[model samples]
Target: RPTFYRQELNKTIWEVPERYQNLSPVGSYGSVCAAFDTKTGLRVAVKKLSRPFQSIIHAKRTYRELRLLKHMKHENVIGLLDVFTPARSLEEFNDVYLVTHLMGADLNNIVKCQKLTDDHVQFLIYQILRGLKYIHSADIIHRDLKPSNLAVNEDCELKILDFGLTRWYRAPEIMLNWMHYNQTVDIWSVGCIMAELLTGRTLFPGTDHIDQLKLILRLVGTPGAELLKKISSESARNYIQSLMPKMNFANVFIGANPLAVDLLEKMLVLDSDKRITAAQALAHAYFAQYHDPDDEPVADPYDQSFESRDLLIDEWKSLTYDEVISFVPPP
Candidate 1:
């Protein structure tokens, strides 16, 4: 299964360090590959960030990704297993190599080709909330949460993708430019993903944000005047001041599990403040078979003051290099 490879080999084909073997072609940010890591003798995923120093913004995001992926050690979440670079010195360092365990497929691919068993649906949803709860406990809103971000293996084991990954299944508040980073935004995406898993299609697939909002309103129904006031952006407020058929679970869901439908409603609640949180979703009856308070982990509060800084590329470089060199591999 050597795709995009014409291997006859003297030196390894990639521009990466020799330890990353058998790179097979595979993100928006970089060329991806499942490379065999000589250290573990297991194929690992790699992302070599493109022109990471192209701008201060890009550098900071890359650094923020590194900072975030570091503290994420939960089994259902992706972690920064190893950070390496082909450059010999900090000045020469212009790229980053993020290596994590290779996952066979993302939910996007799986759902398209194979219909999931309700058993698979139940467990996948549980794992997502489990990971989101850890992220939320730290006051981190994983601004991006979509099916492609959820990595999966053959056994149906799931890992929520990189928090730094961009968003697609966006919350209504985000489209309205509601200037708050609340955890509920992510819960909305979970609801959409859950619906996709159940129906084999996106709950709201729109060509643009405006169209996306309209589709969401039809399913989620209208927001009242009081809820409307929360949206501070006048442009977004006016547009909404202009639109629901209300969702028919009987029509769309057909004979789907009532427990799941109930949980889905809670998650898709248009009010971000009132939306069922990741923590609450885990306890819902839909996951009763897997729920155990003792088993779910909570993350300690993380310091994200670094993301606020408008530091120069040099400062970002120094900060990121130190973190990379500081990595310690487990035995």
Candidate 2:
């Protein structure tokens, strides 16, 4: 079983063997590499997170990420094999290291550089939806679903990673502060990712928050009165109303398959209520031959137990400290 471990930095046993080498950084804060475990002699990816306790927000992020990774288990979701911190105590902790299976490349690199066929696109999206189905079934929303956060091996297996910016991929409901955002927010991001895979560019490459809204308007057009009425913000509704008519999904994805375009249409809806669920998408004609019942079955360990509740600064710190202390390696 994967558990957390506490160790002292600069200790002899803590040393990464000479056979272990740094591959690349997982994100801006961590370094990922394949290393040979001295005891087991098997190669695994080592992810060392820097300055995890920098701030209350950072601390909470670290805690939530560790908690989710340790609990969530699925073929399409990255698994946490082990975790450790160099600090012997919470007071001295500054780094958190995670061990996972090493993958060949990230989806961002693969989609940007690789020559993908129709099968590749189908399988990639299928895997993403599969992973997402499990996440949503656990009542968790993966707010960030871009290419870079998704890891892929040579065999075309994909595992979603990184919860640092999980809240960035907001739906219109979130943008308008409707306070009713849910798993549907992730579906919108899936649509954006699918658009990128089809077009070789980010569908909504917004430079900033407002700019992102503008980019969506430019591509998908303004929403109808029925959907606009649901917007809680008067200014947001007015701004959307001022935009031009929406673009045709087929025309925007001229080269994409008709079924894929249809899926995009269902996914990129202005109203959160109208968006297709992961289960519904999997059953769509877009995945007729690929969506087998046993392709990626749900094995959710969490029973909607972890809600996105707001935490105080002191609570965040305490929770983070307890998280770091929760894991210890075996003797």
Candidate 3:
């Protein structure tokens, strides 16, 4: 892979293009900036990731979201609309810019306020699972699944923010698997977020990751013998062995929709295999009002082979270049 090449399309929108004119940063969220895209007459966010070639893990992380996102095109999932670098050629490619919809995170605001109606909660959670349904069907995993990552508009529409998921929304398998080891993977987070939405309290506010698992099993109850055998960490196994009785979802979320409680238990299942898939969770009675699998689009299985390789920066440079060059903004 010694060949290095660069291209500039003077006649096409593929290269040397700046269609998003008059872009002014109106502050930022970490590496992201809120800016107006004049050409499209819409506001958008630009996430600038610097030194992507700095480490192997960083390079792969960047590629997973970038390349995997390129394959995702769904209503509820955040679409990566623009991908480019300021680099004129391949060698100069170090940092990368990702542009997508610009919606200030308000779901987080609501969590603090926490006075949503059944209609609001139903629609919001439905869309989360709806978006997740597509991701699951496409044979991909978007681990990020919390209220904050859920960008809601004036219409109550929601789009998933990140592909790599975590923290409060972490799955039991992940909690157990760092010692070993996503749709079923993200159920823990979805359930955690849903519980807070219903009850207005952090479901598992553990001080750290270990305490996180302690809180999870305490509430959801311990897993069966089969899952216990698979856990490589003896401490993890022992910790679960000593957990208390499961918290009554109905009583915990008193006055919450019964259907919601049912869904919550399914999602919060301590075992990954027993946990509900996004599609399965969406079909549950809780989302029966908005359940329309017909309208939910599912893409073919995404080929993630590129992400597994140890490619050089130049190689990733060209790949990102082609992805951006080929991007056709959703209509």
Candidate 4:
């Protein structure tokens, strides 16, 4: 295995091959590279955070993502295996690298390239719900739930990825800038993804933020005044008043599985509070055969020994570097 020396760390470690074909699609935060881990003899995805301290928001996002990955452990959530830093001190720490298991492809590719059976949809949705159940139980909301963020293997295992831009999934409360929103926001995104899987199209393919609201309204119908009162934006509330006839679930998902349509309806409710929770969705009749109580529960390996700490811009950058250096996953 090829190795390279790091001046800041004053040590050597395995290096990624040049011209690696397994690079992830360009991401806003940074790029991901697929490489081989020599010590563990495993292929891993190396995510390099770009300009973590470039802005306070960027720094905070980087810190939060890393902390969530470290604290979250479930089959459907991506795992962090190792961390690498070229810098020995906080001042020199510009590059923060996280090592994770390499997955075959994202759900976007799978949904586009392959024909899926009912079994495929059930299994994929089940994993997503199972993962969300864990995340919600922890009081965390995966604000982003698009096909591209879901990673999968050839055997049909799926894991959610990319915490950045999660807020953009655009739940009604989020769009209106409500006082506060909870796990129900994630349920909305799942409904959108489920619609995409059924129709091979994005349920709400909005060109921009405002347009997203328009698209969502066209399908789910206008929100009643009670929910509208919660929205902080007057224009957005007025926009909801503009007429667009809502389509019924049957019309929206023509020819889709009946149970799937039922579940999608539960997820895509215009009122965030009305949206189905992950645990409820998992128990829906759509996944009756797949979820067995007799089977062993899915494993959760997160270490609660470390509390999730929030830090200021510089503090976050420094602490993230320190956490990465000290991270060690269980065998």
Best by lDDT: 1
What ranges in model 1 sit over 4 Å off?
1-14, 164-168, 229-245, 248-251
* Higher-scoring candidate on lDDT, 1 or 4: 1
Rank all candidate structures by their TM-score, best first, as comma-separated numbers.
Answer: 1, 3, 4, 2
Candidate no. 4 TM-score: 0.80
Kindly indicate the candidate among 1 and 2 with the higher lDDT: 1
lDDT of 1 by residue, 1-331 (tens): 1122233222333466666787776644565778898867877888777667788888887788888888887889987778877666898888787888788789887788455667778999999999999988987888779888899988788898768443348887777666666898999999988888887777888878778877888887788777887766798678766755567665667668888888887888888888998888898989988999998999877888997788998899889888888877544
lDDT tens digits, residue span 34-121, model 2: 6656456655688766556777667766777787777667888888866765566656666677787777678877876444666678
Q: Would you give me the overall lDDT of model 1? A: 0.79
lDDT of 3 by residue, 175-273 (tens): 645422146777778888888887777888888988987788778777778877876779867876875667888888889889888888888887677
Best by TM-score: 1
CA lDDT, every prediction? 0.79, 0.72, 0.71, 0.72
- TM-score for all models, in order of appearance: 0.89, 0.79, 0.84, 0.80
lDDT of 4 at 219: 81
Model 4 residue 273 distance off true place after TM-score fit, in angstroms:
0.6
Off by over 4 Å in 3: 1-30, 55-57, 164-166, 178-182, 232-243
How much RMSD separates candidate 3 from the native structure?
A: 6.0
Model 2 poorest ten-residue lDDT run: 6-15
lDDT by residue for model 4 over 62-130, one digit each (tens)? 777787788767778888987666665788877676778888688987888344676778888888888
- How much RMSD separates candidate 4 from the native structure? 5.0
